[PDB]
Amino acid sequence: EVTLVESGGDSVKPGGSLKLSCAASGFTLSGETMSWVRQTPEKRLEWVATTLSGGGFTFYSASVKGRFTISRDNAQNNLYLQLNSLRSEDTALYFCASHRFVHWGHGTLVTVSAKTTPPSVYPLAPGSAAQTNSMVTLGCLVKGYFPEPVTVTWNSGSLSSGVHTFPAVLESDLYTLSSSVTVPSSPRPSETVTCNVAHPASSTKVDKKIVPR
Amino acid sequence: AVVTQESALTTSPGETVTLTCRSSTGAVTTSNYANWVQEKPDHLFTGLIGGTNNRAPGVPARFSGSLIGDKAALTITGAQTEDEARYFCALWYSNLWVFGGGTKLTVLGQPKSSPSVTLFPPSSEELETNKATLVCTIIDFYPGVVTVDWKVDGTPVTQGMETTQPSKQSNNKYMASSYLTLTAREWERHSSYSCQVTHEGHTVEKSLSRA
Ligand SMILES: O=C(O)CN(CC(=O)O)C[C@H](Cc1ccc(NC(=S)NCCO)cc1)N(CC(=O)O)CC(=O)O
Numbered sequence A: 001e002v003t004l005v006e007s008g009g010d011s012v013k014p015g016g017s018l019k020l021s022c023a024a025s026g027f028t029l030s031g032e033t034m035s036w037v038r039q040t041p042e043k044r045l046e047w048v049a050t051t052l053s054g055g056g057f058t059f060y061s062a063s064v065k066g067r068f069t070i071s072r073d074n075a076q077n078n079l080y081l082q083l084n085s086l087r088s089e090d091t092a093l094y095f096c097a098s099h100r101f102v103h104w105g106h107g108t109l110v111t112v113s114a115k116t117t118p119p120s121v122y123p124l125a126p127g128s129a130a131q132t133n134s135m136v137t138l139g140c141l142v143k144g145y146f147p148e149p150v151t152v153t154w155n156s157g158s159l160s161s162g163v164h165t166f167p168a169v170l171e172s173d174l175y176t177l178s179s180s181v182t183v184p185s186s187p188r189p190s191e192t193v194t195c196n197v198a199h200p201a202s203s204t205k206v207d208k209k210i211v212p213r
Numbered sequence B: 001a002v003v004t005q006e007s008a009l010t011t012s013p014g015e016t017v018t019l020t021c022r023s024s025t026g027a028v029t030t031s032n033y034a035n036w037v038q039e040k041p042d043h044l045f046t047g048l049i050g051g052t053n054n055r056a057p058g059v060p061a062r063f064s065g066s067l068i069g070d071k072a073a074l075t076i077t078g079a080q081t082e083d084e085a086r087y088f089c090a091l092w093y094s095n096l097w098v099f100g101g102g103t104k105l106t107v108l109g110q111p112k113s114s115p116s117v118t119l120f121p122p123s124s125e126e127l128e129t130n131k132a133t134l135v136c137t138i139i140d141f142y143p144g145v146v147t148v149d150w151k152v153d154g155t156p157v158t159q160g161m162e163t164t165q166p167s168k169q170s171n172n173k174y175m176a177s178s179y180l181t182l183t184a185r186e187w188e189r190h191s192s193y194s195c196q197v198t199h200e201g202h203t204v205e206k207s208l209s210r211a
């Protein structure tokens, strides 16, 4: 069986240098053309570089030339990539594919940003609302955190169904996440709904009680 | 060069669907070694076709590659439910690889369905920090494609609006969310705010009148 696992990804400051690695298994690297591809936040696939087998040429994308270098470590059955004048444009999930992108390894996120920060929670309550379905939707805006991940729960478990946690969005070197729940207009405001947000890295725990508007 | 792909297509289990790939430089040929891969949820990637016809080991017979017209094409004969995925194409222009934008393929695994839109006004706590994040959430829509457009007093708000990427709910339906960000000052200058969610020819609008 073939196997490719990439590593090396980490946060990095704009201008910073980074070195990624693709370790292979199930084959001999030497007579195997390897490609480095990237999937951007926008969920677009972009070609980065290709190194031919034998001992041939290495082709670079124009978006990468001069700044990124490729290498093999046939001896350790490894493939490296030197990331060097990291620009914003570069935050992405770096994968390595074998010949004609048959086999692909799991990826490694590199994020070009500013610095670590605990999240600011905002309770999102309906503007002097109604109840179409005798159902009301409340949310929580988990804003400006660094780095990922985050843990968002409602009445710590209790509200499970109705809940819709959405993926983060990065904008000025900080993430923006959102979550919600929809309860019958019987439970809120009669009973309370709290959103339990934790930015585990920062060891931040925050509770917000959603109160009318 | 630029490689072009249809945004999205949809079929029913059992049908035959064709996805195409096109080169802006001229007719795609064998010299471009047309390559086709599939992205499954959680960014899982598997190459299906390579060399403009050859089906990679493992991959089932239902996928075929060829050139028809001045383009590369991937035919999925009797398209199964588990084929709902994203299909990318790559063409080799004797020096590099140009990847296309993918096609989100839907295999109608349950009735067409409409989005549940809800617009949230900015929090007070937040207005104090001089920021105004309006949140628009889109839910339980099927197929997983939507266009969000923002309007402030009629005028489409051309910037500082970020939308997410549809994701799968346990009911294999999808969700998304858009944001608008103004300073607390920009917010004050306007009395009307609209979030518009278009889905299969049908615009859904949710609003709030600030003043
Ligand atoms: O594999 C790639 O990424 C490119 N492929 C096309 C393909 O395999 O789909 C094409 C590649 C053939 C190949 C080799 C080199 C060039 N370019 C040269 S010599 N440029 C000189 C610049 O001064 C083009 C094509 N491979 C042939 C094949 O797969 O049969 C060689 C190989 O795979 O080892």
Ligand SMILES: [Fe+3]
Pocket: A033, A099, A100
């Ligand atoms: Fe090749």
